[PDB]
Amino acid sequence: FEVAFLLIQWYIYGFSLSAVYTCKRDPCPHQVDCFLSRPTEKTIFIIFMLVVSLV
């Protein structure tokens, strides 16, 4: 379970969050730009959770 959850967590989005996200969706015209809430703190907590899972 640990290994599978870690693999899915890596596959979906990796191990970091970017401040700027490029979104291409049907309602949005052409290629729109969006921004995350607090990417750096979320990335830091991602790193702690990944380390805890590894340990």
Place this chain on the structure above:
Amino acid sequence: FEVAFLLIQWYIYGFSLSAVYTCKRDPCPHQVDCFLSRPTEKTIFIIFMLVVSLV
């Protein structure tokens, strides 16, 4: 003068106006979409002016 003005008028934008315009500019992020005021009436008047110039 007639011929040169007609050639420039054709070269810059052609002889018709489209309701939807795709704009790519430095301030605008990615590729933005804009709309003209009254494209059909403007196109009709373009056709009259082109015909008058030709005559």
